[PDB]
Amino acid sequence: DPLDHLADKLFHSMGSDGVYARTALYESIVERLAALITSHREAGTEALRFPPVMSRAQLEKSGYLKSFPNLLGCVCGLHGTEREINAAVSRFDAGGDWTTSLSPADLVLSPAACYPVYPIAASRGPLPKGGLRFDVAADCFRREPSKHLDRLQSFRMREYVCIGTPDDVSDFRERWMVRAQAIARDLGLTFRVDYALKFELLIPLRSEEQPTACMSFNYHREHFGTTWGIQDANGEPAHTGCVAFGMDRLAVAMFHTHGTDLSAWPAKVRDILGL
Amino acid sequence: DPLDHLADKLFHSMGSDGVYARTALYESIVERLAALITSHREAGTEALRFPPVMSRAQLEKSGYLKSFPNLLGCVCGLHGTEREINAAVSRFDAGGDWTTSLSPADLVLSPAACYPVYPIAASRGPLPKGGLRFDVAADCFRREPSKHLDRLQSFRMREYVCIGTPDDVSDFRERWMVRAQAIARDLGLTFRVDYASDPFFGRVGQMKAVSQKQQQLKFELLIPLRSEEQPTACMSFNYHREHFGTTWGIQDANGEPAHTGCVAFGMDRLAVAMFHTHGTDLSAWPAKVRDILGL
Numbered sequence: 001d002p003l004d005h006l007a008d009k010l011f012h013s014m015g016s017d018g019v020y021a022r023t024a025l026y027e028s029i030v031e032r033l034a035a036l037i038t039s040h041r042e043a044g045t046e047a048l049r050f051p052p053v054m055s056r057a058q059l060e061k062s063g064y065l066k067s068f069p070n071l072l073g074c075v076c077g078l079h080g081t082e083r084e085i086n087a088a089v090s091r092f093d094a095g096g097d098w099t100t101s102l103s104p105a106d107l108v109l110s111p112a113a114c115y116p117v118y119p120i121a122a123s124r125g126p127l128p129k130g131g132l133r134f135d136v137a138a139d140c141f142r143r144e145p146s147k148h149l150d151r152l153q154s155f156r157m158r159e160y161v162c163i164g165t166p167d168d169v170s171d172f173r174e175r176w177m178v179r180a181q182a183i184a185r186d187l188g189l190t191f192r193v194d195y196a197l198k199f200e201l202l203i204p205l206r207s208e209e210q211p212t213a214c215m216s217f218n219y220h221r222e223h224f225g226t227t228w229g230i231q232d233a234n235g236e237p238a239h240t241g242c243v244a245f246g247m248d249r250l251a252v253a254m255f256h257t258h259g260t261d262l263s264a265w266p267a268k269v270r271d272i273l274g275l
Numbered sequence: 276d277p278l279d280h281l282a283d284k285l286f287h288s289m290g291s292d293g294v295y296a297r298t299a300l301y302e303s304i305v306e307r308l309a310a311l312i313t314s315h316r317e318a319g320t321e322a323l324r325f326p327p328v329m330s331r332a333q334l335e336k337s338g339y340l341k342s343f344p345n346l347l348g349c350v351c352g353l354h355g356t357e358r359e360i361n362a363a364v365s366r367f368d369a370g371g372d373w374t375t376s377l378s379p380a381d382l383v384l385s386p387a388a389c390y391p392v393y394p395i396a397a398s399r400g401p402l403p404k405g406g407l408r409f410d411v412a413a414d415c416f417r418r419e420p421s422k423h424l425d426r427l428q429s430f431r432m433r434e435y436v437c438i439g440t441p442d443d444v445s446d447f448r449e450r451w452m453v454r455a456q457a458i459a460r461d462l463g464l465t466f467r468v469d470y471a472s473d474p475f476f477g478r479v480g481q482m483k484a485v486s487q488k489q490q491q492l493k494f495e496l497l498i499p500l501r502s503e504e505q506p507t508a509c510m511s512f513n514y515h516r517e518h519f520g521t522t523w524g525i526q527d528a529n530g531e532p533a534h535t536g537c538v539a540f541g542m543d544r545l546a547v548a549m550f551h552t553h554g555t556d557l558s559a560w561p562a563k564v565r566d567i568l569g570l
């Protein structure tokens with residue numbers, strides 16, 4: 001695979017495909033890309049940072065389990081009595097399986113950064129005119145094992161979320177599809193925005209025929225507004241959309257494009273990232 | 276609880292105890308504390324950043340089940356056939372339980388940031404003289420639901436790890452116990468460093484804890500968040516002896532099983548300690564504290 005040699009300077013193996021330790025070089029770039037996304041944050045956007053886990057009931061209610069049940073990472077634990085837990089560990093010692101004593105927790109590993117934001121916005125009552133804007137981030141999980149550096153199991157997602165009327169969401173989606181292209185241009189990245197309701201900014205990483213989706217522009221209709229009872233300023237079920245940045249894909253795209261030597265990156269690129 | 280008043284400015288509920296959305300105010304402080312820890316990084320320390328998950332086999336091999344089986348968060352999924360997965364989803368649609376079809380993955384949610392570093396160091400062969408030093412971080416998970424702001428299920432851990440001879444590790448810990456106290460002092464925090472023990476599970480766990488405490492293998496920097504009677508451990512200074520060196524076959528420069536130690540900073544506990552101590556208005560924080568954090 002073309003991306004393969006990148007691993008030497010960017011990652012260390014953790015004994016699981018798509019789960020890697022990140023070097024100081026790789027992390028410095030993710031942080032600079034994060035800071036660059038932040039610099040493009042619109043006024044009146046509330047920044048929230050989510051942990052890698054979220055409510056299982058919220059995710060179930062959000063319709064994920066129907067669309068990608070195979071990708072969901074659920075949190076399980078040993079929730080039994082001290083005797084049951086000790087017996088599970090003793091089975092492990094005697095060459096058996098301790099995992100039979102696991103039971104699901106009330107938590108899942110988040111498959112997308114924005115999911116927890118919709119119940120949060122709903123708890124505040126009706127939306128003001130113009131709606132709400134959020135800046136969210138989380139370490140996401142998708143059970144898709146691969147040896148390719150642009151397909152991970154654990155990866156960072158950063159998003160700008162619009163909650164309001166279809167007009168609010170439409171104007172937001174239009175502004176962001178323009179802005180995200182200007183960002184990738186500033187980064188010296190080669191791309192095309194194509195259809196995937198869903199648009200993706202695709203960057204050739206292995207092939208020009210099979211490019212990698214490094215950003216997404218999603219429209220959810222009134223799906224989340226209806227699910228959570230989010231009322232817009234006119235008392236109607238709210239519409240939602242989100243602009244998502246694949247932090248790890250963007251970082252891998254940067255290294256594939258410009259190489260692992262930061263001193264040799266273009267001056268404009270180095271300038272916009274504050275290098 | 277005495278910390279509850281802070282929740283409004285720092286967190287948003289996520290529908291689960293000890294799992295919170297962080298506000299821009301709270302996050303700006305965690306980042307400044309992270310940058311401050313980084314400024315104290317010793318020369319020749321390799322910085323690695325770990326994701327929130329790690330190999331279940333590596334954790335099993337590390338002996339985590341012998342110590343805290345009750346705290347472990349395991350990744351599960353629907354690993355069955357297309358028919359079994361479709362049936363699971365259909366049960367969920369019909370008000371039933373889809374979770375019966377879950378089976379464990381080859382991954383766990385990391386309970387401590389340093390765990391993945393030991394197999395990484397072992398893969399490099401024998402240690403050089405003076406050993407190896409690592410700077411590690413991860414979002415950790417411990418199955419300990421609580422409504423207290425200093426007891427989370429998902430929390431950030433930052434550590435400096437020493438791998439080498441018992442001398443290398445011992446010098447490193449003493450050096451860091453001095454430095455960590457100077458850091459908390461600079462932060463305007465009230466503290467004490469005391470002998471400690473890990474909360475080992477069950478009946479044997481009580482014996483393992485008393486034995487760990489007497490051996491002085493663990494110290495904690497405790498900050499009163501409720502009282503001096505019950506302070507909060509915001510940092511730990513752990514000496515692992517040869518546990519990880521033996522497990523992973525880490526050989527020191529003398530061909531002996533390597534000794535290991537780690538200095539761990541509870542990012543979320545330190546941030547909560549800062550807000551409890553100095554309040555939620557950053558402009559009113561002491562000048563010396565604002566200066567050291569670059570505010």
Ligand SMILES: NCC(=O)NS(=O)(=O)OC[C@H]1O[C@@H](n2cnc3c(N)ncnc32)[C@H](O)[C@@H]1O
Nearest residue numbers: 112150151152155213214215216244245246249
């Ligand atoms: N809420 C909006 C959303 O979720 N949208 S969407 O596309 O699923 O994912 C958002 C972005 O996350 C990145 N991404 C997705 N899957 C992976 C993966 N397996 N490895 C690395 N990066 C990935 C990718 O860059 C994708 O465009």
Ligand SMILES: NCC(=O)NS(=O)(=O)OC[C@H]1O[C@@H](n2cnc3c(N)ncnc32)[C@H](O)[C@@H]1O
Nearest residue numbers: 387425426427430508509510511539540541544
């Ligand atoms: N490797 C070394 C180590 O793991 N060491 S240690 O077990 O002691 O955890 C390290 C630090 O993580 C923080 N910490 C631990 N548990 C929690 C929790 N439930 N909520 C918030 N912060 C916590 C706390 O500040 C503790 O001192």
Ligand SMILES: [Zn+2]
Nearest residue numbers: 112114159242
């Ligand atoms: Zn989204």
Ligand SMILES: [Zn+2]
Nearest residue numbers: 387389434537
């Ligand atoms: Zn450690």
